[PDB]
Design a protein around this ligand. Structure first.
Ligand SMILES: *[C@@H]1O[C@H](CO)[C@@H](O[C@@H]2O[C@H](CO)[C@@H](O)[C@H](O)[C@H]2NC(C)=O)[C@H](O)[C@H]1NC(C)=O
Ligand code: NAG
Ligand code: NAG
Length: 752
């Protein structure tokens, strides 16, 4: 049985996925295909320029249809190729079950006839330049209409979009309307009173008053930002706000009592009118980013009584000459009694002290505080001890320098208190910086130039710290007492620290790993450890070690000094020895790895041989990863009986053949990656019995020997459930004509 929707892929939830197939038109699927099981059809990024009456006409249960990026407009086309999509009149009418349509990024100039089942319609980046009562007549179900980017720099129209008065009044269920990047100068008259989300950003609506929002009292989100922009630091075409604008009247929003979110970013505001927020008693989110409010926020009263507000964005309110603002928050920030999140990144100010955030200090719910990219170079970090609810501070990308004058490395996201000081100019860490920060659970100091002696005296106050990121620094030398002042430490990232001339004539002392009793995850990746190191790592607690990007090759050529290097990690589960220049491997060196290992990576070494019988010496191994080595074959014995191996990756080798029965004895094997090798066939004999056990068999990017009709294709059709991208991504290597084309290309489809 062929893939039922060739060239496309059936996926979960009745989705036929035809994305990215260079298709010139919509496939006419066969009669025996389960056309009725199809509820969603995706055709993203093909090149269908002509749609017909009969294209969708027999998909009796089709609900979602995505035709995005098929006939892109000149301006959006990389090579400015003009495109005007032809759409036969009944093309969509013939899908009377259709509920969701995405026609974005296509050269269409009018709304085609749509059935009245439609609930969601996306027409963004098309060339529709008019909307009137005849445009979406009778679509009484429609809840979402998105039509952004029909007239802007990447898709110009020489004029404005025209939404006629009442054009959409017939749409009595329309709750979501977006009309950004349409070159509009006023808000369309008489929009459905049912609207709850109205996004009008990035037009040229430079003036706003309460009648512009007439009758829209169900509005929960209003976005009118980017309508009189500042252009000093784009990037892309941008029209500056004309001099005496914007003109927001003082009671514009005062009848929108259900409003939860309000966006006034990039509106060139030098000043806030307190009256704008009067009556907005449900307002939880306010975005004032990219304005000119650096001076205003030191004295404003506009925030008084926004007692329900939970998120406030003031980011990129910076002097356009590019210099420091003097930041002292106005007292009315203190009235934000419900504030959970405050974003103040990219304002630019020299100093973080007691004065700076004073009015915030006692807000009982304030949890997240974004202060990155401010070029702060003096910070009193003690100020954060007396914030009652702080969970996260981002001070990354500043120039602070001291006190005042995933499976291998977990994230800090569920922790109670995290401070990120990455990308500052920290060279040395004084322990008094954190004297008022005993409660910190996660500390990030990556991408500094820390070249200090780490000797057990740097982080003394931080008695609660569970996670320390010191990756990407200039740490010279690890001592036996390094990090031993951190009693509760669970994760430690030291990746990308490599100063081979600065070791003071000695080597790394890795005995500190044995001193950290709660440590679970350690990374020493890209440290350039060739030599000059302790002979043994020892830990009863450690679960994951990333040792990638060193030279164990050199270590293990150096006699037998380093043959038990990892053995003392009595509970190691995950070990990454990828990128270690490993040319050979003794079975005696593999058996000296911790017996508890479940997962071993050797991505990107130079291994041309592997003794597969030596996998008995790792009885608990479940995932083995040998991607990117030089295996020429899978041979020299087979996978031995009893192996617990479930995931095996041998992608990106030069595997030309596999011996018969190579995978026969691996009864737990479920996932096998054979992608990007040199295979010319796929054989059932490789798996003895048990081929139907595999849940994933990836055989893409192989130079398969396509012939009419090769039996390996029979095999892949039999186990097609496990083969990802079978209908399109499993390709031929020969003959010359079918080279790089699908194994089911027109020519070969005759031989089935
Ligand atoms: C099998 O291996 C191939 C090649 O290594 C994988 O393809 C890569 O997938 C990663 C993400 O997993 C991408 O970053 C790369 O861009 C992909 N490269 C190529 C050439 O495809 C593939 O994902 C793996 N398959 C499975 C099922 O894990
Ligand atoms: C926006 O409208 C003006 C005046 O109607 C026009 O000159 C300009 O070209 C339009 N912008 C685009 C991107 O087409
Ligand atoms: C490692 O560190 C401790 C000092 O705290 C020392 O006693 C031990 O002998 C050192 N080992 C080496 C090889 O230098």
């Amino acid at each position: 049985t062929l893939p039922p929707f060739l060239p496309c892929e059936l996926q979960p939830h009745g989705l036929v996925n035809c994305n990215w197939l260079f298709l010139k038109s919509v496939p006419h699927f066969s009669a025996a295909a389960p056309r009725d099981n199809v509820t969603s059809l995706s055709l993203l990024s093909n090149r269908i320029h002509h749609l017909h009456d009969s294209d969708f006409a027999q998909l009796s249960n089709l609900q979602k249809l995505n035709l995005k990026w098929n006939c892109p407009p000149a301006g959006l086309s990389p090579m400015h190729f003009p495109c005007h999509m032809t759409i036969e009149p009944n093309t969509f009418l013939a899908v009377p079950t259709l509920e969701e349509l995405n026609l974005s990024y296509n050269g269409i100039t009018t709304v085609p006839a749509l059935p009245s089942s439609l609930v969601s319609l996306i027409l963004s980046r098309t060339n529709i330049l008019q909307l009137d009562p005849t445009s979406l007549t009778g679509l009484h179900a429609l809840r979402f209409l998105y039509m952004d980017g029909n007239c802007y720099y990447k898709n110009p129209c020489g004029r404005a979009l025209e939404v006629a008065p009442g054009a959409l009044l017939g749409l009595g269920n329309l709750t979501h309307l977006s009309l950004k990047y349409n070159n509009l100068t006023t808000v369309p008259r008489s929009l459905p009173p049912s609207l709850e989300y109205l996004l009008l950003s990035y037009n040229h609506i430079v003036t706003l008053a309460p009648e512009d929002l007439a009758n829209l009292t169900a509005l929960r989100v209003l976005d009118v930002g980017g309508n009189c922009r500042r252009c000093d630091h784009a990037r892309n075409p941008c029209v500056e706000c004309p001099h005496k604008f914007p003109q927001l009247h003082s009671d514009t929003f005062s009848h929108l009592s259900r409003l939860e979110g309000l966006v006034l970013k990039d509106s060139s505001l030098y000043q806030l009118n307190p009256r704008w927020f009067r009556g907005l008693g449900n307002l939880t989110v306010l975005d004032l980013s990219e304005n000119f409010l650096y001076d205003c926020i030191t004295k404003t009263k506009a925030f008084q009584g926004l007692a329900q507000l939970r998120r406030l964005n003031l980011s990129f309110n910076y002097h356009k000459k590019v210099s420091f603002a003097h930041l002292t928050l106005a007292p009315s920030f203190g009235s934000l009694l419900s504030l959970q999140e405050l974003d103040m990144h990219g304002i630019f100010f020299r100093s973080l002290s007691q004065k700076t955030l004073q009015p915030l200090a006692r807000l009982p719910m304030l949890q997240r505080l974004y202060l990155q990219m401010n070029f702060i170079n003096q910070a009193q970090l003690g100020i954060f001890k007396d914030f009652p609810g702080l969970r996260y501070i981002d001070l990354s990308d500043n120039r602070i320098s001291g006190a005042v004058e995933e499976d291998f490395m977990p994230s800090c996201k569920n922790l109670s208190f995290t401070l990120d000081l990455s990308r500052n100019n920290l060279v040395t860490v004084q322990p008094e910086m954190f004297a008022q920060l005993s409660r910190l659970q996660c500390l990030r100091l990556s991408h500094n130039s820390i070249s200090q002696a780490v000797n057990g005296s740097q982080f003394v106050p931080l008695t609660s710290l569970q996670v320390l990121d010191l990756s990407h620094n200039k740490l010279d030398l690890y001592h036996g007492r390094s990090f031993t002042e951190l009693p509760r430490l669970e994760a430690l990232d030291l990746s990308y620290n490599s100063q081979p001339f600065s070791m003071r004539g000695v080597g790394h002392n890795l005995s500190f790993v044995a001193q950290l009793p709660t440590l679970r995850y350690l990374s020493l990746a890209h440290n350039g450890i060739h030599s000059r190191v302790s002979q043994q790592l020892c830990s009863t607690s450690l679960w994951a070690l990333d040792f990638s990007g060193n030279s164990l090759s050199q270590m293990w050529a150096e006699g037998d000094l380093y043959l038990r290097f990892f053995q003392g990690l009595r509970s190691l589960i995950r070990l990454d020895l990828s990128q270690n220049r490993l040319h050979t491997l003794l079975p005696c060196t593999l058996g000296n790895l911790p017996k508890s290992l479940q997962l071993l990576r050797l991505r990107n070494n130079y291994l041309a041989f592997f003794n597969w019988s030596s996998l008995t010496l790792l009885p608990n191994l479940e995932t083995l990863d040998l991607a990117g080595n030089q295996l020429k074959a899978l041979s020299n014995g087979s996978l031995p009986s009893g192996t617990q191996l479930q995931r095996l990756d041998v992608s990106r080798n030069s595997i030309i053949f596999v011996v018969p029965g190579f995978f026969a004895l691996a009864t737990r094997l479920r996932e096998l990656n054979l992608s990007a090798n040199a295979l010319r066939t796929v054989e059932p004999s490789w798996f003895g019995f048990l081929a139907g056990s595999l849940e994933v068999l990836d055989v893409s990017a192989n130079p398969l020997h396509c012939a009419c009709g090769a039996a390996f294709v029979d095999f892949l059709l039999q186990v097609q459930a496990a083969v990802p991208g079978l209908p399109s991504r499993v390709k031929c290597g020969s003959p010359g004509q079918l080279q790089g084309r699908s194994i089911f290309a027109q020519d070969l489809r005759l031989c089935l």
